[PDB]
Swiss-Prot record:
More details: IDO1 is the target for therapy in a range of clinical settings, including cancer, chronic infections, autoimmune and allergic syndromes, and transplantation.
Induction: By IFNG/IFN-gamma in most cells. Exogenous inflammatory stimuli induce the expression of IDO1 in antigen-presenting cells such as dendritic cells, macrophages and B-cells.
Record flagged with keyword Plastid: no
One Pfam family matching this protein: IDO
Subcellular location: Cytoplasm, Cytosol
Tissue: Expressed in mature dendritic cells located in lymphoid organs (including lymph nodes, spleen, tonsils, Peyers's patches, the gut lamina propria, and the thymic medulla), in some epithelial cells of the female genital tract, as well as in endothelial cells of term placenta and in lung parenchyma. Weakly or not expressed in most normal tissues, but mostly inducible in most tissues. Expressed in more than 50% of tumors, either by tumoral, stromal, or endothelial cells (expression in tumor is associated with a worse clinical outcome). Not overexpressed in tumor-draining lymph nodes.
Protein name as annotated: Indoleamine 2,3-dioxygenase 1
GO molecular function: electron transfer activity; heme binding; indoleamine 2,3-dioxygenase activity; metal ion binding; tryptophan 2,3-dioxygenase activity
Oligomeric form and interacting partners: Monomer.
Catalytic activity entry: D-tryptophan + O2 = N-formyl-D-kynurenine; L-tryptophan + O2 = N-formyl-L-kynurenine
EC number: 1.13.11.52
Cofactor(s) essential for the protein: heme b
Amino acid sequence: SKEYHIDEEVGFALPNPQENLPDFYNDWMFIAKHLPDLIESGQLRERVEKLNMLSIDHLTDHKSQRLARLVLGCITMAYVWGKGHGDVRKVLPRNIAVPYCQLSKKLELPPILVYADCVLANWKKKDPNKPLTYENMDVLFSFRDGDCSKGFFLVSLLVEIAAASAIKVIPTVFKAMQMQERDTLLKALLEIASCLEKALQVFHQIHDHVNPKAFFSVLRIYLSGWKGNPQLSDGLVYEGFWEDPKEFGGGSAGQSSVFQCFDVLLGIQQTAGGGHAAQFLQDMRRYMPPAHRNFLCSLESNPSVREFVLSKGDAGLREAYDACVKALVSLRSYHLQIVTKYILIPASQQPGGTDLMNFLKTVRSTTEKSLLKEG
Ligand code: HEM
Ligand SMILES: c1ccc(-c2cnc[nH]2)cc1
């Protein structure tokens, strides 16, 4: 279980992320902490081009390597996208590309900013004795003033944390199936449903902290990657590390282990078949920390909860199972309504969307298809 790097309180999020690196990395830190100013005044690219190549050896534990990935990922997005108006750099200068690629190799993550960087490791409490609540929290790194990165990253994190309450019930579910403990199983499924239902109320905060225009025209640009992307159609050159340009997708909650883990738990076969949705979410597991992709693989290998419940002729168990599935459907329906507000409407107002909505609707429909009763 410890091999899976799951926290009792914060689940897949990194507990108490580190905020400072060794003084040896001050040159990186200085750029990452001043991105909005450096990007806006046109100083960011020259500063990156001027860095000396720093060795990754003095980053000696997981938390410091994770902070360094966050730093280097944010700087890389700023260097590639610049001021976010379509002037793009196609080559990442060796003095940053090399350590970023070596550090990424060591962490078994791709050399692009991922969800586990900009959400799961990108946070702090304001006051260490107050709860994990939005008002008591902040992000460590933003891209531009007004980009709403705080509201976007933290609300994602707060959903991620609410879902965590359900993760610790998972071994109860499997124990109860194998021990033939019907009441324990039912109580465990109801508890999972309850937490997933709570996570939905958390998502409502998106409307308070994120504004559609800033999201659509700024933050979305900085989180974009270079896979299937016409602005960088062969991907990015990581100078001095690979000879040929490489394609990696940009930051995506398709990379969240929370939602992928409940679909697997419940037998929702989100990654089955050869369709586009299934392959994208399968591919995103490559963008998750290895301990969390290990967790998902081990869930896949357990007896099927859905098969257990379907074979008992037990209405209580069916209804509890269905409450879990329904909770995921309600989350995904609410999320679709967010996407209409934050992407479809802004894109209509500026002087594509259907493929996005069709991906999301495929995943919601696959979830709905798992209901045992029409729920
Ligand atoms: C402004 C708010 C948001 C917008 C515009 C938005 C947009 C999108 C888009 C475009 C995708 C498709 C995948 C991709 O392009 O990378 C997606 C997928 C997804 N988003 Fe969001 N999102 C928002 C907030 C959230 C939050 C707060 C969460 C909670 C962690 C979340 C969880 C998901 C999940 C899990 C997927 C994968 C599909 C699924 O499992 O249903 N999103 N989102
Ligand atoms: C950081 C935080 C959230 C996201 C996201 C939300 N929905 C899809 N991706 C991507 C990066």
